[PDB]
Write a protein that binds this ligand. Sequence first.
Ligand SMILES: *[C@@H]1O[C@H](CO)[C@@H](O)[C@H](O)[C@H]1NC(C)=O
Ligand SMILES: *[C@@H]1O[C@H](CO)[C@@H](O)[C@H](O)[C@H]1NC(C)=O
Ligand SMILES: *[C@@H]1O[C@H](CO)[C@@H](O)[C@H](O)[C@H]1NC(C)=O
Ligand SMILES: *[C@@H]1O[C@H](CO)[C@@H](O)[C@H](O)[C@H]1NC(C)=O
Ligand SMILES: *[C@@H]1O[C@H](CO)[C@@H](O)[C@H](O)[C@H]1NC(C)=O
Ligand SMILES: *[C@@H]1O[C@H](CO)[C@@H](O)[C@H](O)[C@H]1NC(C)=O
Ligand SMILES: [Mg+2]
Ligand SMILES: [Mg+2]
Ligand SMILES: [Mg+2]
Ligand SMILES: [Mg+2]
Ligand SMILES: [Mg+2]
Ligand SMILES: [Mg+2]
Ligand SMILES: [Zn+2]
Ligand SMILES: [Zn+2]
Ligand SMILES: [Zn+2]
Ligand SMILES: [Zn+2]
Lengths: 430, 441, 445, 443
Amino acid sequence: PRVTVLVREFEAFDNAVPELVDSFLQQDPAQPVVVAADTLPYPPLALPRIPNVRLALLQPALDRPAAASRPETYVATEFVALVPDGARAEAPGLLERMVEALRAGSARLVAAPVATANPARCLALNVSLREWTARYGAAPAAPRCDALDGDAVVLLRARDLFNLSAPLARPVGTSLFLQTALRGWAVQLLDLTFAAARQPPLATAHARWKAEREGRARRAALLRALGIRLVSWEGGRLEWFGCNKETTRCFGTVVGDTPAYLYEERWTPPCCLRALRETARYVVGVLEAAGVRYWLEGGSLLGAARHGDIIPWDYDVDLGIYLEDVGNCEQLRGAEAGSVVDERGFVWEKAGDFFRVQYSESNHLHVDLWPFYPRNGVMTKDTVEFPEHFLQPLVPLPFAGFVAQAPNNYRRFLELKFGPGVIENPQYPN
Amino acid sequence: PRVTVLVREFEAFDNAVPELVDSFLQQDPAQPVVVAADTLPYPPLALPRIPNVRLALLQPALDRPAAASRPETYVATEFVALVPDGARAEAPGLLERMVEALRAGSARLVAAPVATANPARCLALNVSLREWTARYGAAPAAPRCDALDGDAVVLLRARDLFNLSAPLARPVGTSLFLQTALRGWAVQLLDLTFAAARQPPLATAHARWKAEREGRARRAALLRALGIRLVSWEGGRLEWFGCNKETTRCFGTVVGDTPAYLYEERWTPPCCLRALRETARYVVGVLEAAGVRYWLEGGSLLGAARHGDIIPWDYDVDLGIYLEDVGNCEQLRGAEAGSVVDERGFVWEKAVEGDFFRVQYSESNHLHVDLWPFYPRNGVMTKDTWVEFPEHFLQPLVPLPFAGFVAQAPNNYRRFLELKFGPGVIENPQYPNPALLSLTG
Amino acid sequence: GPRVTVLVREFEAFDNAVPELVDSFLQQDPAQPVVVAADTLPYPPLALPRIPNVRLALLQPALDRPAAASRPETYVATEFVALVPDGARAEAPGLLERMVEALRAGSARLVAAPVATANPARCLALNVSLREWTARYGAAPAAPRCDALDGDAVVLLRARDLFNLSAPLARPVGTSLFLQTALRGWAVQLLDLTFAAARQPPLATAHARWKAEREGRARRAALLRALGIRLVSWEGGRLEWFGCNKETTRCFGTVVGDTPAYLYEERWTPPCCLRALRETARYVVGVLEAAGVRYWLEGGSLLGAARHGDIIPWDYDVDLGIYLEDVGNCEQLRGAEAGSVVDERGFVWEKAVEGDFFRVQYSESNHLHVDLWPFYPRNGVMTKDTWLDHRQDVEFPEHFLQPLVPLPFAGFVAQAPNNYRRFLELKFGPGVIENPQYPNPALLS
Amino acid sequence: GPRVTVLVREFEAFDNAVPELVDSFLQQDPAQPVVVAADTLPYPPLALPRIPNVRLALLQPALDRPAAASRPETYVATEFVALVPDGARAEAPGLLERMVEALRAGSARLVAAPVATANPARCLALNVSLREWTARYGAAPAAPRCDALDGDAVVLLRARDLFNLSAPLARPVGTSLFLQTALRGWAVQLLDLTFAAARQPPLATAHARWKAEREGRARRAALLRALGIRLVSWEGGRLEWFGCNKETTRCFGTVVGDTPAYLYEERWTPPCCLRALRETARYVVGVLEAAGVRYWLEGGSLLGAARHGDIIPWDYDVDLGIYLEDVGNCEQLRGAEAGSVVDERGFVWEKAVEGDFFRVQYSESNHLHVDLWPFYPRNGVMTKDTWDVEFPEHFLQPLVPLPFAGFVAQAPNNYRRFLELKFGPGVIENPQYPNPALLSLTG
Ligand SMILES: *[C@@H]1O[C@H](CO)[C@@H](O)[C@H](O)[C@H]1NC(C)=O
Ligand SMILES: *[C@@H]1O[C@H](CO)[C@@H](O)[C@H](O)[C@H]1NC(C)=O
Ligand SMILES: *[C@@H]1O[C@H](CO)[C@@H](O)[C@H](O)[C@H]1NC(C)=O
Ligand SMILES: *[C@@H]1O[C@H](CO)[C@@H](O)[C@H](O)[C@H]1NC(C)=O
Ligand SMILES: *[C@@H]1O[C@H](CO)[C@@H](O)[C@H](O)[C@H]1NC(C)=O
Ligand SMILES: *[C@@H]1O[C@H](CO)[C@@H](O)[C@H](O)[C@H]1NC(C)=O
Ligand SMILES: [Mg+2]
Ligand SMILES: [Mg+2]
Ligand SMILES: [Mg+2]
Ligand SMILES: [Mg+2]
Ligand SMILES: [Mg+2]
Ligand SMILES: [Mg+2]
Ligand SMILES: [Zn+2]
Ligand SMILES: [Zn+2]
Ligand SMILES: [Zn+2]
Ligand SMILES: [Zn+2]
């Protein structure tokens, strides 16, 4: 029952890694221990310079072979125990007990909380790469759970850990369970408890603030690298890691009306959909304030009728307007002369049948406004047409978080523009 | 089929990779081709959907195994030919011709220029990790080279390429030869030319500007990641990638009188030495203009007498001054009352601890020159906080080159240094010892 | 499931196939843990792959290394370890796994697979007797279950078992390992699995093999001497000696307190010392008989003869009584009164300094000796003028020498007093024949 | 409970006072832990008290013992160990307790108390240089704080410190312990405490001392060779050598791949090898000057002369250039063209296998060598028709004196230039000592 202790989560400026290692060596002087780091930690860890204690540096180096940064190269045992900074080994044979529980149980990961101020708690975790979203909540089948929040020693087989794509990506507490829950693996939170370091790290408030700031930065870089734009929680809390008003939109310029995310087998990033909803809400409010007649058109109306929201793989919003009302709103009249950035940061342009309103100068998620005019009972443009009675009157229809205006009998409207059964038969990307 | 074509250097928004792949498949439909990218290139490359053509996405992903991001997974031949975008296979049998050249010669790499506007040139290259420097120059033994500049097809054994730490780090033209030259590997530039693409990529000024801005940023991030702080060409045209007046110094706060770079088995970063030289030159200029008697002290005098410069693993500069001259310098007068940032950004501070003066390069970069005031008492210069020495060593002072300018030293500075440090200290440098530092701490 | 560390100990720095050995295992598993152990840093350089799963363990002391750096167990983190000799290669995949599976399913603590060299391993029996400084090898009665192996094999066992041995990696391992495992009652199961030989084997020339076998023979002799194995025997009767001879010093040096140093080490007289004592006793008896000197077995030599016709197994000399008036009959004896004498066969004869007796040493360098004690009859009682402070040195009736009787001793027939049971009990006490004890029980019994 | 274990390692089996030593400590505290350590069972018997707190530790492999039995840590259950030499005696009670209090309150990893023998312990300075294979001793400038002790002392330190060393009990302990502790930067504090001498001291006769010193000198010589200490010096002088010489082979033997064995050991050239190189260079230069052969420092020899007036400390040979027209002046050189020549002082002169140069070896057995490279002017440029880059002739018109290896040698004029033509700009100012990590990557 040989188990390698692997230490990955610690701060170079303030840690208790020397105590952690010394505590395990007191139980077994030949205990295999691997401390992993991206760069050489300074101030020096001053680990014992003995063969069974090794420092694994995970970044590329001009003077090292490929194997030097591959962590499975440092681990020869069957099992590996991820130990966070702040833990120490007090009683003996706790790793042995964790191995017995693993072999006895049915979960590929077992875990023992560390008696810190934040001991690990069970969590449910639901990962959707298609929607760039990870959803956390309370674990129904605790102590069997999908993920952990807080400090714990996690033990699993080395073949399972090191076949993951990013086994030691920081923060491990986020990166590991995103990967294991995606594979359908479970973590069993055992009744065992590891003691806290007798001289804990981050004792001052300034040190904790510094470490929390670095940790938030690593977590944001981790999720952006792995394609999680949104972390949502049971209870409603949202964590965003995508585009915003001051950034580019996530996918950039589209070619052949097929954005980049479709080729990646994903749908629209949720940050982009959120920006489209807020631009739709804003533009609708401006048009209504100015007394401009608008209705939902195209895929926006289709999504409204289907689920009251933007079709989750679409990337813009379409609205029809009465051409004779264009002069009622200041932004459209200005858009005739040139680009208009109003006081809320939205960009109105004509560019030349329709109008386009972009979320901001940097974020080019947009709503298109298509003017129509009644020639003799039929609404028509100049660069397909439909009868005007579909607009007399307009009906309230929920869309993107607010009540929009839609053509009356819009299911019939949508089936003239798209064909029979379009609401019930979404054209899923493949 | 013994060679796998590997394409790493291209841009997603403007490339000729489809023509490249097609040109090799026209010569052999079974030719193994691998296009490597960090993320899925957009717009779609639309490569042929055949077994011998594979798109390798090297970034880790939540739904992929570890092997998916390791490039050797995608190659099953003995050799790899790194082909840059803009090349095209025209004459058949060029890859087999490069293989026979490789086996018959003594170079680990062989290369063939691509007939673009920037065809590959033979270069010399020495990599010094201790000095954080990559020194380029004209190749003395061309067409045997240490590195190439320009477009070339580079062929080498897959075993050699994928044994490197960063085999496909971008730009390849930079990272590959930094790694192979450090290992003492040569590349032989053959008398073989690959044709250019018939529709070349980046054919407009705007497209090239986008590509060069992105390639410049990738090169800067690569050299910082790999610890190359200075790149030179024939000892000149310096390119810096380290600290400066507006940043922190490279190694930050020193613990246990041992800076971080010693634990990394290197010497002082050259950007840090450059800033130390500039600060010593500036402080000396100020002290001389104000009429302050100074002399090189400690390891600065030792370095000056040894080779006329800072000891390349030291991280500060020491000067002795006459205490009765302190009042002549505005900055030193101001330093007694508090921290002073002078008109050129240097920070002058009075050490309340050891009673010396410290001049820092800038408010953010704490590379410093220390000033040690001495006063005579019965012919011996002495201090009040802590070795004292006879004053006759200062009567008179002598000129001594140091750090690119002529500094002042005690007369008989060899005897002076020997009394301070011991006999033979000038001829026996205390070279850094990683093995010993690993044992002592 | 099973993690196994390959450990390489048996190779020569001047000529080896260790690079091919390690690379062959790395081709089956790139992360395969491999430990090469050496006493000093091999030059020319081994040039192993400088990857973290391949490590070199130097078993020398060094001023800049902790104690753990030379203890090989700190390099092995796996449950199992496989000793692999130079000249072997990993060809078939998963052989270490099959060896682990056979270990767990069997009852032996060691399992082994031969290597397809010109000398593949063979099953051997072995009992070790430290007290008699002897290791006895024979044919395996219950093959494929053995006490030892002869030849090249991969040997797999638990790290906890290997590194709790006193000298796990002492060279040659093929000798050292099984001396330690057989003494502990452990068995090695010889499996029907075969490792391939290296494609470019080491020691390809006759001259390279010649300097390798001489270096190995030097290491084996040093090993057995360090571990106290004086004699190795094989079925068929072949003997290898590693102790005394005519041309060296005796094994144990000067004796204080009647108790030689090996008895405190809980061992008996080394078998080489006993052999020399028998040869010297046989020779001296022939000289005295040819010279017409009446002699009889005395002291511990007579007691050992009466018990089992041989030297007492912990005794260290041989004692004979002779008639004083016969001394002039022997040329060596007459010369000994004038000084030290080295005779026709290299034996050294001297008149001692202590107490009026003669001593015959095996050689000038080897001081195993026969002591000749001259007696003369006063009036029916044998006596002498100077006495040693032993309870065994007394007068005795001359009728015990009239006549002398034959008695086997040390491989030949010797002359003994008649009624030697009563003779021995008079000088040693009742029941001495039936109650063996060490020379002086007050210090060691 | 006791906190110190007395450990005895330095004694002779044939003549010791270890029984008196043990008894004296047991008289102060009958439970006092005592360990006597030895490579083999001491004979004659020590006859130590048969009590659980007195144990004989045998540091030898044995067929019938576990690995723990030969590890001294196994025998010590206390925090501290007191290494006590033979000839010491415990009289004043509680001396071990004072040493513990002294160690805890001070800043030295070791503390020590002299034994009142004829050779009390003295405070010494000690610099250990593994790269130079040298142990340099001297007077201790900051006594009572020392790097090493010479003489008899009880030395106390933590068990975990002592047994963490590679060779904690290697003999002589007086040498091996401080070589290990001084290299680590540990200090020993010589306390103002004195242990008494044994009432019946060991080795009381001149003959017994002579045998003990002979065995101890043999142990020291084997210890220093095993640990890679080739040179011991006192105050820079009184040299004591433990390496190669005129009668032996050179330390590193045959060089493969132009990378001598000491580089892989992460050390520089052994000082015995450097000493023989300086002697051979001085001899050869003396021969060539007396015979009228014009020579000059070449290659790395000239570089070492210009940098610090000596051989570069990681080089292993010496290179000189000569005028080919002058080779007939020297008898040794003229005989070297016919074959190998062993001159009157044991030096071996040979003409190169291939390469057309001369080689002078220190002796028939020691192959440390000086190479002579003959050039000849071809219209103002020096050239050898065999290939040492060709250079113009005016650098030898004239030659200049340059200190090298303890004597004055000839160098090309403007040798700073000369070196930069052959090695590159700034070569004198930029020495790069061996990089073992780069060697581990390069091969
Ligand atoms: C043992 O010595 C090594 C130095 O070689 C050091 O790293 C380690 O911490 C030491 N251990 C103890 C317990 O002193
Ligand atoms: C994950 O999916 C299940 C259905 O498979 C759903 O019931 C559950 O609520 C999801 N988890 C979270 C945290 O939303
Ligand atoms: C992945 O799993 C396989 C099978 O369990 C194993 O052979 C391989 O070593 C693993 N990869 C690692 C540990 O990197
Ligand atoms: C990879 O490079 C290392 C040098 O760090 C070398 O030791 C090793 O042999 C190389 N492996 C291969 C397969 O070339
Ligand atoms: C000796 O065996 C024990 C178990 O019996 C084990 O815990 C220990 O690690 C072993 N020692 C060595 C040096 O392998
Ligand atoms: C030891 O080294 C120091 C500093 O290098 C030096 O001052 C001292 O003289 C040296 N002592 C000896 C005995 O060599
Ligand atoms: Mg702390
Ligand atoms: Mg659109
Ligand atoms: Mg300083
Ligand atoms: Mg007898
Ligand atoms: Mg006797
Ligand atoms: Mg040479
Ligand atoms: Zn977005
Ligand atoms: Zn810098
Ligand atoms: Zn013997
Ligand atoms: Zn030498």
